[PDB]
Design a protein around this ligand. Sequence first.
Ligand SMILES: Nc1nc2c(ncn2[C@@H]2O[C@H](COP(=O)(O)OP(=O)(O)OP(=O)(O)O)[C@@H](O)[C@H]2O)c(=O)[nH]1
Ligand SMILES: [Mg+2]
Lengths: 157, 154, 249, 115, 51, 81, 55, 85, 146, 51, 297
Amino acid sequence: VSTGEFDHPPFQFRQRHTFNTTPLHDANRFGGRTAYLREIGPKKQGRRFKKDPRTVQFNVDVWCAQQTLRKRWKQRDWEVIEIPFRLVPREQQRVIPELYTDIPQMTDPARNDFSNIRNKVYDREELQGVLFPAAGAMLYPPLQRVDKQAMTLDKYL
Amino acid sequence: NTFLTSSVATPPISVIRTGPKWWAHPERMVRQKLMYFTLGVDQLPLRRTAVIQRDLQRFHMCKPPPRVGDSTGYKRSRAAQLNTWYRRIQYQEYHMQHLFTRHVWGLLRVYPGNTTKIQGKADDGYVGYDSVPFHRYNRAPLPFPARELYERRK
Amino acid sequence: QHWHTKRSVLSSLTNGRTGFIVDGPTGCGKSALMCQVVHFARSRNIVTLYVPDAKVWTHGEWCWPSTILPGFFDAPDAARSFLKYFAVANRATLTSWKLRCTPKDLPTEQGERQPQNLYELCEWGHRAVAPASIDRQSVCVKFLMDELSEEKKLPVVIVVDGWNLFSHETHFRYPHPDFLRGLASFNESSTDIDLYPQELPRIPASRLSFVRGLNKMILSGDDPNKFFITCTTRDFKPFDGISGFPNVE
Amino acid sequence: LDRHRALADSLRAYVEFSTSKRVEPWDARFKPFDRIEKDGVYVLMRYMMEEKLQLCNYHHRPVKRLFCNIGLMGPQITTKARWKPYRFATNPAGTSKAERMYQRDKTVYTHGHND
Amino acid sequence: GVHRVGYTHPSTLPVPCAQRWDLRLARARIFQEYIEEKAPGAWQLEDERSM
Amino acid sequence: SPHGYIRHFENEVRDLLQYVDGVTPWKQAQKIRTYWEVRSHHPMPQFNRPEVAMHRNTVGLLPAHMWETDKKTGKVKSVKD
Amino acid sequence: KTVVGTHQKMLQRKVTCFQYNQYGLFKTPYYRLANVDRYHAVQGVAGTREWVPYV
Amino acid sequence: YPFLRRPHINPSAPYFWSFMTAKSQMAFLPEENYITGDWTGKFFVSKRQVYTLQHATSGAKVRVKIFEFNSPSRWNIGKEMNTLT
Amino acid sequence: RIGPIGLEPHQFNVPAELGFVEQYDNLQYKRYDWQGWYQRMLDVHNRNVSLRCRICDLQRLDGNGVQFVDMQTERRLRILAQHRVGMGVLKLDADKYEDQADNVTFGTTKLSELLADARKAQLGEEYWPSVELKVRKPSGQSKAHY
Amino acid sequence: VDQTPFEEDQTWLLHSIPVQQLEMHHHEKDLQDLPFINHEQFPRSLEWNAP
Amino acid sequence: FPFQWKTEDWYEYEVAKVRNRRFVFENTEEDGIRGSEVTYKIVLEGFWDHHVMKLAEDVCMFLKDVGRQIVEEKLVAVRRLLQGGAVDPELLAAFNCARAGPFGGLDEYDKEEVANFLRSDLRRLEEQCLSVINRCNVPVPGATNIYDPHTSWPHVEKLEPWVRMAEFWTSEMSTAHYEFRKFFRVIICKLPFQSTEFEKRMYDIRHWLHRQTSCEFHTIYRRNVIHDSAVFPTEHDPATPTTHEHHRMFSFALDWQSAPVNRLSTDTVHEGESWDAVAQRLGCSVGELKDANAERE
Ligand SMILES: Nc1nc2c(ncn2[C@@H]2O[C@H](COP(=O)(O)OP(=O)(O)OP(=O)(O)O)[C@@H](O)[C@H]2O)c(=O)[nH]1
Ligand SMILES: [Mg+2]
């Protein structure tokens, strides 16, 4: 669910800066990207593409796809490294179908882990023996994991 | 504020006749309360504007009964008495919004639109980067760049 | 407030860690709890480092490289506000703070006194004229973090709102090397810095001079004196698969 | 005979438009360009980006892309700060008036690219 | 940002395995797939109206 | 017989291209020029468009030897044949 | 990989005069005269309501 | 009306080579600037024939459907006859 | 069940499906001078034949005793046929030639070419397709040491 | 040498990307002329699955 | 309950469900109405919905009485094959064909085990032939439902009508909205054997169809395909591998041959070669070389 604007406003008579009324090509709409298709004054191939409804809708569909791409790439705190089949963990020793090939696969339902394998992200400090066997100096420190059974401040002791 | 174009003014009776569309839109009316709640003042003309328009939208689909005839003009004049009372309250909140948001804009160093008066900074209509190169109503040429209403450092 | 007699108690509470991080969903009592901790500690006359929102440091206005630290950067507008309000908050304790490891040949104009207290050091940093305040805070923040890391007797509570912004990359990026290399013309220089924008690698928070002094006291185990009761922030924008453009009103 | 002359006249006015210096395309009212000349953005422009803006002669398209690759104030330098409009940023250096954009020559066919 | 696309031969890795680029070249060998050379890595835009 | 796209015509593309050079001599195909080879006879073919790099145009890109400009305003007065 | 360099540039020039020597090559797009009626002489324009595409 | 589908089909300095011209310069000249086969002579040439150097050098006959160009010059080389009128 | 049967150990038998459309007119284009091109237009439009085979039927023993498709074989087969494999069934839609008889022959050689490259995983571990792990960036604990 | 997809909005804005000017074209939706002049050869159902 | 999910799993679900629409194996070695050997779909097309509905009652009753007869004459052939018979020596040689079996070495099947495997498959054929016959005796005209697979054979499947509207002037005065439409009914015939007598009878239903009503036929049958590992061998990758320059535009015709690649089955013996030297050069056994060359001693 997203509350941003996706469609372009239609064509009518020339709007004015009023209450609940913005001009059709303004710097506020779509982050100022309408300056490519705006007219300041209140050459035939360079005038008619600004007034075609299918043409101005396709450009917003490109700009909204650019906004969809940059937020999907800013979510990536990981990267894809081709790891061979022998040094991979036990949940990746299975036959993994490609994207949109099968049902979205659970990781391992036998161990009560119902999650998609395609969104599984492994920490880099776990695979130091696989990714860096040539260094031999432990370039990344081990992850300090907190003791869940230790009496701490959250357990009133 | 990124709306710096020249604008067209509307009479206040055309604003309130929109009703739930723009004047009493609930997303707009709740952020007008947060302006008054930040400054520590009563939202008293705003709440009584909202209580009236809450009940006005409740019966707005009902058709009025046919006025079959009265010898004296009593309930017709009384229904118009309450109707002209509801407009004067919403005339006050229409003035209360425009007074306070121009007082807030003088504090936050935010420049208004064209030909807009802020009482603390620019008593005349502040015009910045207009299509017409001179003042629209004061008949004076605009300098380049735009007029600095505030000091420099943030 | 009396940690040296209750040291085994405080080590068992934090499970040996340096402090607590408070995490949860958005809009819960995270920053509302962190402002209570400075209300708890400064009423008990304890010296507190309070960062009220970490998005002034990481997601700040502009980034400047450190004058005395090579390869490190600074948030100068966030630092002058930090060096101002920390001096006023703990003025009762920083005036009694004697400078142990601080050089006494600091640059000082006519009419100003050389700092002998940690309160006087922070007032040397933020109280100056522009642009002389830009390089003065980089000297002051580095010598503040050097003075705090050597104190092993007074408890210093360090409260940070939004430690997750200090745990990853600040939104600033590195400058392009053509800006510092120097050019004679643009048409024959084999550059496109004015033609096409590009994304350089992003600067992490560990390269900031403020967070360098914090991470020095966290990782080095010779400081059983600083308690980092911090929290995270979930003030990010929503994104649920698709995204259009946000309406400005 | 005059169409060949007007084509060379319009091409000469476009190249002199590319060579001449423009005014600052950033608007000095809005954040962060509102600040003083000795703090903030103008410090970073004076010591790191002084020759980069002077060589491109302050046209609005190169100086915004130089603000992208400088990295120390992005990405909110271009979107948050309001810039001058397209017909306002094409005015030459030392403009100081709003009549200069209509003072320019209307005889050439540079499509709005004349001084 | 701007980078160079790398390739690791199976003789270089301590555990050899078939890479994903020579599997792409094997897929392009069978089904006769045209590999556009100047296809940009930054321009991967989904048709979000349909997908 | 293949059908549909041109990717399914393997032999017919091979049979066309061998037939293309079979009838065509190189004495004929040398006279076809591209657009930039014709534009080189202009007094100035190359200048930057205002989309990307218009600021890189210098005064040495103008063919100033083939015109005469006025001394007062700076505009071109005449053209040379 | 077999045809590169001058073998590519001469083949593109040989295929250009082979394209140009064919007098009567139908390079007209389809939408230019796809509005012809068979029962009457009324001429419509494809894209508007004065033409139906199925019949 | 459909977008730019009319059957019946201006100077600019910075868009000189990109207005009413080909997209690329590596593309060859169109068919109207070459002789296809054995001809008896054309009364007119088409307006999409690009003016070359040999048009102004030889200058025998320029017949554009009418338009007879008796002013040879070097500023016309590189663009078709649509922009020349 | 029609089809050739191989008894040699270098020939594996794949039980596969073939789906096709045959359409003949009976109302208007049943017979006249337009029947010649209309029936050909129906045959060219119905040139598709769908060669479908389960990967479970490919996991049998070959003539040499070894399994035909092992785990690494179908892992190589799912990558070489990305969208042609779906719900455990390798589907091939042949649309190259106008007649369906040549599309069955073109579909057969494309199945055998895809199977022969997937059979390289039985040669050694150097032809096993690599697992793509989305390994994380270095964490904030390791970034504190920077 | 190739570039990753950008993470900021101003880099997508300020990059030299041309907009659509002429009529857009698809490789298989050009036999059908327009969405109003959508041509169908045989009147099959839109949910017709090919065996 | 209630159903709350992450959106990217929902984005993966809705794309995978539509792309895997016709990725279905119809003829499975299984139980009743799902499992079959051949699948016939006859898509009937007419202009009115009651025209295709009344034809779907006319064709289904035709294919019920015909389909019961062909299964019954097949059922009388299975019950004779299950009573007793002699095993084909071509069938016996098919089981004893592989070099190594599952248990290592040659798996010598005798005449009892090969006759056991066809008996296990003919027992499946009886239970599938009785599933067709028992469903062909159900739809009495007192109570009949030909749209359900469990009751009647064959069952009729609904398909949505192709409807395409036209918007034209009635003159710039007004606009008329008329639509072309035609309705579809699909008849799914699942037989657990391939019989050309039923395919001949199914193809001849076009000659007695209803007025202005046509049909098309879909046939999904099982067919054995041979993957020849000698014509299409599994080879190591070459020393100099291919690059993207071999996969350019117009490289599908100029750089690559069609599959398969010709490999020479003829060779000439060199000077000092013997029977073990040619087999070393050809990478084969010396007994394998003499079996193909039994003409020359
Ligand atoms: N007075 C008071 N208000 C509280 C308390 N807890 C939550 N609130 C209210 O809850 C809201 C959330 O406060 P924050 O702590 O800033 O929310 P948050 O978890 O930090 O949200 P993010 O920064 O986005 O992660 C505040 O506006 C408070 O009004 C509390 O203990 N006392
Ligand atoms: Mg918070």
